[PDB]
Amino acid sequence: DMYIERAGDITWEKDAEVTGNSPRLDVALDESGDFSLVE
Amino acid sequence: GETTDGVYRVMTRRLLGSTQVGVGVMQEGVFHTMWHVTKGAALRSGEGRLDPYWGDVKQDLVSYCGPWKLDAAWDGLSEVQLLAVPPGERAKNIQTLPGIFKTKDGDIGAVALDYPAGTSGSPILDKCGRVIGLYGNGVVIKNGSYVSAITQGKRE
């Protein structure tokens, strides 16, 4: 049996760590919900 | 059980110790997570039970106790925050500018951030604190890095 435990409030944090890039990708989505790259 | 709005961990005692299999959002009495986290199984919250109400394997989303409530959308221009809830670690906000998943059925925002498997279901927020989608379903690009879609459901 799975169970849930509270982890926090949902709030925007001012001055949070800023990272990650912004890739523009061509993708396909199948019937099983799997994303794949179109090339 | 506990029904206060906020982010929650999805745990299991089926495997060794207590294992975090994912994350979800409690909003307006409904718990929202990704389908691959629970596979549609019932959830426990203290002594209370949460039963699935809606789900779809292709969208990779599921809601418990009521219909999908999250309807905010990424504006296509601004930075957002992943409110990451990693296994055994404290909730942390990570700010990023989303990229784009271009599909035959339209464009979807995407977040280039890599976290452990049990982080799927962590909410992605706009500057107003509104959940614009959940993190955890995406693809592994050329350099072996992970990129998640910003997955949002439909509010009937």
Ligand SMILES: NC(=O)c1c[nH]c(C2CC2)n1
């Ligand atoms: N393929 C991967 O590297 C992997 C899978 N899932 C995740 C994150 C939890 C979303 N990373």
